[PDB]
Each structure stands twice: as C-alpha cells, then as structure tokens.
Write a protein that binds this ligand. Structure first.
Ligand SMILES: COc1cc(CCc2ccccc2)c(C(=O)O)c(O)c1CC=C(C)C
Length: 264
C-alpha cells in the first residue's frame, strides 16, 4: 500500500490546513464557483455592468464612482488581510517564529495571497463582490477613468491563467501556506526556521496534488511557476498606488494597507 508514516503525517497536515482555511475564509472557491456557474436560484448575484446597474446595485446590495469602487476594494483587502492573518496563525510553527519575522512574512505575503484567492472569485467576464451577492464586469471596471480603469486588468489576466489549473480549496489551503512561509522575504532575521516549515508545506502540497490531481502532470511545478505571476502583479499594483497618491491627494488609504506598502 502507498501510505507510509511520513506520507501519513503530510496527509494530516493537509487536512489541518484545509480545516483552518474553511474556518478563516467565509467565501471559498467552492461557494464562488457555485454562485458563478448557476448551482442556483438562491445564490444568483446582482450584476453591475454600467452606471445605472451600479446605482441599482447600491440599492439592493457620494463621491466619484471610480473612487467609491476603489475604496470598496480597499476595505475588502483589509478584511482579507485579517482573514489571512487568522489563517497564518494556524500554520504549524508560524506563531513560534520571532515576532518580527511573523510581521515580515505577513507584510510581503498577504498581497500575493489576496490575488491568489481573488482568482477564485473571477472568471474571464468579471468578479464576485460583496460576499458573492454581486458581480462587477471586467468591461465596467476597465471603463473607469484613468488611472482606476486599469487597476483590475492584470488581476483578471492572472486569474484566467491561474484558474486553468483547476485547483480546489484543499489545494489552495496548502499553496497559500507555502506562500506565507517564504524564507526569501526581505529583512528576515532567522531564515532557517521558516525554510524548515516551508519544506514541510512543500512536501504536503506535492502529495496533495499527486493524490487530488493524478492525471495532471507536473501540476506541482506549474503551480510553483505561478508565484512569478503573483510577484509581478504585486509590483505593478504598488506602482499604480504611487500614481494614485499623487493625482488623488484627497483620497485616504487604510493605514494597515499603507504599512504593508511601506518600502515593499
Ligand atoms: C473591484 O474589486 C472589488 C470591488 C468591490 C467594491 C464594489 C462596489 C463599490 C462601491 C459601489 C458599488 C460597488 C468589492 C466589494 O464591495 O466586495 C470587492 O469585493 C472587490 C474585489 C476585490 C478585491 C478582493 C481586491
């Protein structure tokens, strides 16, 4: 039989992470795909695709429209940062790390994770919003005044590609744990304890994918290669925020987000 004690421990680790992910993230990929695909009469989103539907959306779900949307987006990111911080504490070994490194791991990790999980809420046509009650189209977003009309496009581009891996939540739980425990983060005090945890997470992810996706060759490698896409989305996003700060000096940014962005 395949399972030995070592691979048994990796299965127990996969199970624990999946459990913690479910407990930390109220809107899973499974729920998102059920809303998006019409496993539904109770789960249908209201669709925002223009100014009028936007106005009607606000009714059923003050400033300039681009700004309201961007701020709505900032607030959800703050929520996601909180959910991800709750999840991270569940990753075995994580809270036993030097407090400074915990902060560093989160600071550089959370945006990569946000866009990973945001892919679960996207298809080629738009993105779920407000806990799945709404769906805002990609074209509507793209139509926003400069520079806001461009903020979401690289996220959709990534999501379309990432979604072709067809990962489910149990896969993603291990993958986002791997992301958080990156020993290559800038300013880390003790890299070794992080690398040892990541090594364990990596073995767990490898096994999960082999078992969950037996006909999907080199999926593990293909998934690791996606980290390059995420890192690049994050860099572009930060650059676009520097532009927004200067053109929209009357627009405030959540300090939790501001501290994350500080010298990324
Ligand atoms: C465009 O990106 C939005 C925007 C929004 C704001 C949608 C909105 C704002 C203001 C008026 C009408 C609709 C939400 C939301 O409200 O849940 C959202 O989850 C997202 C997903 C984005 C993330 C997690 C970065």
């Amino acid at each position: 039989d395949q399972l030995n004690p070592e691979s048994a421990d990796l299965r127990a680790l996969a199970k624990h992470l999946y459990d913690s992910y479910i407990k930390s993230f109220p809107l899973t990929k499974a729920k998102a795909r059920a809303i998006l695909t019409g496993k539904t009469t109770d789960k249908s989103p209201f669709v925002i695709y223009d100014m009028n539907s936007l106005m009607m959306g606000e009714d059923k779900i003050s400033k300039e429209v681009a700004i309201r949307i961007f701020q709505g987006c900032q607030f959800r990111s703050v929520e996601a940062v909180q959910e991800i911080t709750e999840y991270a504490k569940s990753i075995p070994g994580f809270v036993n790390l030097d407090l400074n490194d915990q902060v560093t791991l989160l600071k550089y990790g959370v945006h990569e994770i946000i866009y990973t999980m945001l892919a679960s809420l996207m298809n080629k046509d738009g993105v779920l919003i407000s806990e799945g009650q709404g769906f805002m189209t990609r074209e509507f977003l793209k139509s926003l005044r400069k520079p806001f009309g461009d903020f979401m496009e690289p996220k959709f581009e990534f999501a379309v590609k990432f979604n072709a891996l067809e990962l489910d939540d149990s896969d993603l739980a291990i993958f986002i744990a791997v992301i958080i425990l990156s020993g290559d983060r800038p300013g880390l005090l003790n890299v070794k304890p992080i690398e040892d945890i990541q090594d364990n997470l990596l073995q767990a992810l490898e096994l999960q994918l082999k078992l969950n996706h037996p006909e999907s060759s080199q999926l593990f490698a293909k998934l690791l290669q996606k980290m390059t896409d995420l890192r690049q989305i994050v860099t572009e996003h930060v650059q676009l925020l520097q532009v927004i700060k200067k053109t929209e000096t009357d627009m405030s940014l959540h300090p939790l987000l501001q501290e994350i962005y500080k010298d990324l």
